[PDB]
Amino acid sequence: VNSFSGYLKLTDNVYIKNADIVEEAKKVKPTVVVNAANVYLKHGGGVAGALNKATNNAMQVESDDYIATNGPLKVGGSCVLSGHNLAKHCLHVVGPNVNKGEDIQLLKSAYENFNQHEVLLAPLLSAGIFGADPIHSLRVCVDTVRTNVYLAVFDKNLYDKLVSSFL
Numbered sequence: 506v507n508s509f510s511g512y513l514k515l516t517d518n519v520y521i522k523n524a525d526i527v528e529e530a531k532k533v534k535p536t537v538v539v540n541a542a543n544v545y546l547k548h549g550g551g552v553a554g555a556l557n558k559a560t561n562n563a564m565q566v567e568s569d570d571y572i573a574t575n576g577p578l579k580v581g582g583s584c585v586l587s588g589h590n591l592a593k594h595c596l597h598v599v600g601p602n603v604n605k606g607e608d609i610q611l612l613k614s615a616y617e618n619f620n621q622h623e624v625l626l627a628p629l630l631s632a633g634i635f636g637a638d639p640i641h642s643l644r645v646c647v648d649t650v651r652t653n654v655y656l657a658v659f660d661k662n663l664y665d666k667l668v669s670s671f672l
C-alpha cells in the first residue's frame with residue numbers, strides 16, 4: 506500500500522488522476538517524480554518549468570551543473586537528480602518533441618526509463634507543448650512501463666478525453 510489517493514486504475518500497474526503533478530508531488534513526496542525534460546535540462550515551461558518554479562529554481566541550478574559536467578542527454582534518455590522539496594529523486598526523462606520533428610518511436614525508449622524505478626509519479630511524456638498525441642502517449646506508457654506508475658494529468662478536458670477513450 507502507498508499514499509497515492511484518488512487514482513483510476515487503468516491496468517495492473519498504471520493509475521491516473523486529474524491533478525497538477527506539482528501538487529501531487531507536494532502532497533505525496535514520492536520516491537520518484539518524473540520531469541518531462543529536454544536534452545539541455547532547460548526547464549523553461551510545461552511540466553519542467555512548473556516543477557522547477559516549485560523548487561525556487563534549485564532544480565535548474567543543479568541541472569546546469571549536471572550539463573556542464575556530462576553534456577546533454579539523448580532524446581529517449583534520462584538522468585536521476587534530486588527531487589528537492591518535491592520528491593526524494595527527480596527522474597528527468599526526454600521524450601521526443603514532435604514540434605522539432607523528433608522521431609515519435611523514441612517515445613517507447615523514453616518510457617523504458619521508468620522501469621528502473623519500482624514506483625513513480627509521472628506526467629504524460631511528449632504531450633502538451635512537446636506536441637505529440639496524448640492518447641498515443643498513454644498507450645505507449647501502458648504497453649511499455651511494467652513498474653507502478655501514477656500519472657497526474659493537469660488538464661481536466663484532457664483527463665476526461667483520456668479516460669473515455671482508453672482501451
Ligand SMILES: C[C@H](CCN1CCOC1=O)Nc1ncnc2[nH]cc(Br)c12
Binds near residue numbers: 524541555633634659
Ligand atoms: C504533461 C501534461 C501535458 C498536458 N497538459 C498541458 C497542461 O495540462 C496538461 O495536463 N502537463 C502536465 N501534466 C501534469 N501536471 C502538470 N502540471 C503542469 C503541467 Br504543463 C502539467
Ligand SMILES: [Cl-]
Binds near residue numbers: 552
Ligand atoms: Cl505541457
